[PDB]
Amino acid sequence: SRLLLNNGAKMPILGLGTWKSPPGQVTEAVKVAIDVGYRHIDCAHVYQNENEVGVAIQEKLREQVVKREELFIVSKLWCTYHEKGLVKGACQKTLSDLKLDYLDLYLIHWPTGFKPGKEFFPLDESGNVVPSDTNILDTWAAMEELVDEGLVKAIGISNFNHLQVEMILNKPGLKYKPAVNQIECHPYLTQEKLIQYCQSKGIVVTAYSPLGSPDRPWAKPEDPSLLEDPRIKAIAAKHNKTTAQVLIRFPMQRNLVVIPKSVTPERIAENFKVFDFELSSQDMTTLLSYNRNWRVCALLSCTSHKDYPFHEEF
Ligand SMILES: NC(=O)c1ccc[n+]([C@@H]2O[C@H](COP(=O)([O-])OP(=O)(O)OC[C@H]3O[C@@H](n4cnc5c(N)ncnc54)[C@H](OP(=O)(O)O)[C@@H]3O)[C@@H](O)[C@H]2O)c1
Ligand SMILES: CCCCCC(=O)O
């Protein structure tokens, strides 16, 4: 039900994702999620909906449905806020929108730093992303002081390859180890190597886009669909479960935290009924063989950035 982090905290294995959840639909989505039993919400400043998520969290807290210590709220530091003096400000903005006084986990969204400004993806006269000269080590030192100031209980990373995680772990004077590395993971991108590396170092892995993210704005009609994969449909039918329930249970049995996104009440409910069954070792090994190394989030606009994470094997 919950995984132990290196800071002593317990992180709920199942969480509700909020990327692409419209401002006018997410408040109700989070309210239903909390009613259904979700105790973990994944957020980010760049999703442009934290205020509305915060409205839901505030209502359930006032209603006595849950107490703050029961919830595990996660947010992420965007690329345009990597410089030393901007990290605290970004964290505080997220805290005010969510209407909380601390986050359970704060992640560096991407290892790539962009030029500070109002645009999430700053462009030059040529049209490409403008990089910041900041590095991963300096941004990490700024995240560490957020822990020292009481703004966040744990800090982590997202979309960091193994060498980038290595840099943080080998940093002179390292005070706090990354608690979590949130990466893309599903049957078409199994990440066996990165997952084995992180887990050996005591870093919890959170699998995002577990259903293949069928609502990504860059979707194409010829792209493979996990939910419609006949091979996965067969495993689901063998268990009297839906394909989504199988795709959510899959990472859980690999000791990964999973965060499926949904704004639909019946689906939020369906995605929760994943604790009452088990996939056999055969089902697990079969699902792992479906790997194609297909990424939903490849951050293609930053392929030339000095800290682009996907050039290395893992
Ligand atoms: N750290 C990062 O860089 C990063 C990147 C990507 C995602 N994430 C996080 O991961 C979360 C989940 O990933 P994601 O949003 O990419 O997509 P996902 O969870 O893989 O898929 C979401 C899509 O699947 C649909 N869906 C949900 N449950 C379903 C069900 N039971 N049956 C059929 N369809 C279902 C949703 O539809 P409805 O909503 O219409 O129900 C939505 O269209 C994100 O919201 C975000 O919080 C993090
Ligand atoms: C700018 C849109 C960012 C959403 C994909 C992510 O979570 O990184």
Among 73, 97, 93, smallest CA distance to 81 is for: 93
Q: What are phi and psi of 186, to 5 degrees?
A: -165, 175
Strands 16-17 and 40-42: parallel
Tell me the one-letter amino acid at 188: Y
Tokens of 46: 């760049």
What spacing in Å lies between the alpha carbon of 107 and ligand 2's midpoint?
13
Strands 180-184 and 155-158: parallel
Does 232 count as an annotated binding residue?
Answer: yes
Token pair 């935290």 is at which residue? 257
Does 298 count as an annotated binding residue?
Answer: no
Residue nearest to atom 2 of ligand 2 (CA): 46
Token pair 């990490």 is at which residue? 140
Strand partners, 189: 186
Q: Return d(Cα 172, Cα 198) in angstroms, integer.
A: 20
Please give the helix or strand (H or E) that residue 139 lies within, else none: helix 136-148
Catalytic annotation on 188? no
- 3-state SS string over 228-295? CCHHHHHHHHHHCCCHHHHHHHHHHCCCCEECCECCCHHHHHHCCCCCCCCCCHHHHHHHHCCCCCCC
Q: Return d(Cα 231, Cα 228) in angstroms, integer.
A: 9
Q: How many domains does the chain have?
A: 1
Token pair 């193994």 is at which residue? 162
In the three-class reduction of DSSP (H, G, I as helix; E, B as strand; rest coil), residue 167 is classed as: helix
Residue nearest to atom 37 of ligand 1 (CA): 262
Given 47, 81, 188, 308, the catalytic residue: 47
Helices 243-252, 281-288: inter-axial angle, 10-degree rounding:
100
Strands 16-17 and 10-12: unpaired
Contact by Cβ (8 Å): 37, 5: no
Tokens of 210: 């577990």
Q: What are phi and psi of 123, to 5 degrees?
A: -120, 155
b/e burial code for range 129-145 (CB count within 10 A of at least 16 → b):
bbbbebebeebbbbbbe
Strands 155-158 and 105-108: parallel
The domain in which residue 162 lies consists of 1-314
In the three-class reduction of DSSP (H, G, I as helix; E, B as strand; rest coil), residue 182 is classed as: strand
Question: What dihedral do alpha carbons 171, 175, 177, 182 form, nearest 10°?
Answer: -90
Is residue 259 within 6 Å of ligand 1 at its C-beta? yes
Q: Return d(Cα 259, Cα 182) in angstroms, integer.
A: 10
Distance linking the first and last C-alpha atoms of the chain: 28
Contact by Cβ (8 Å): 147, 155: yes
CATH number at residue 216: 3.20.20.100
Sign of CA dihedral 277, 281, 282, 285: positive
Indicate which atom in ligand 2 lies nearest the CA of residue 44: 7
Does 186 count as an annotated binding residue?
Answer: no
Mutate to test the pocket of ligand 2, among 18, 19, 109 (most ligand atoms within 8 A of CB): 19
Is residue 212 within 6 Å of ligand 1 at its C-beta? yes
* DSSP 8-state assignment for residue 108: E
Q: Return d(Cα 305, Cα 111) in angstroms, integer.
A: 10
Count CB neighbours of 170 within 10 A. 9
Q: Return d(Cα 256, Cα 236) in angstroms, integer.
A: 20
In the chain, the largest separation of any two C-alpha atoms, in whole Å, equals 55
C-alpha 161, offset from chain centre: 15
Is residue 264 within 6 Å of ligand 1 at its C-beta? yes
Mutate to test the pocket of ligand 2, among 42, 45, 46 (most ligand atoms within 8 A of CB): 46
Is residue 19 within 6 Å of ligand 1 at its C-beta? yes
Q: Return d(Cα 141, Cα 159) in angstroms, integer.
A: 18
Mutate to test the pocket of ligand 1, among 21, 50, 206, 209 (most ligand atoms within 8 A of CB): 209
Q: How much is the CA Rg of the chain, to the nearest whole Å?
A: 19
Experimental method, per PDB record: X-ray
DSSP string, 3-14: EE-TTS-EEESB
- List, comma-separated, the residues after which the chain is broken, a break being a C to N distance over 2.5 A; otherwise answer none: none
Is residue 50 within 6 Å of ligand 1 at its C-beta? no
Tokens of 53: 């998520």
Does 255 count as an annotated binding residue?
Answer: yes
Resolution (A): 2.0
Q: Return d(Cα 310, Cα 68) in angstroms, integer.
A: 37
Indicate which atom in ligand 2 lies nearest the CA of residue 121: 1
In the three-class reduction of DSSP (H, G, I as helix; E, B as strand; rest coil), residue 166 is classed as: helix
Cβ-proximal residues to 144 (8 Å cutoff; 6+ apart), any chain = 155, 175, 176
Contact by Cβ (8 Å): 210, 258: yes
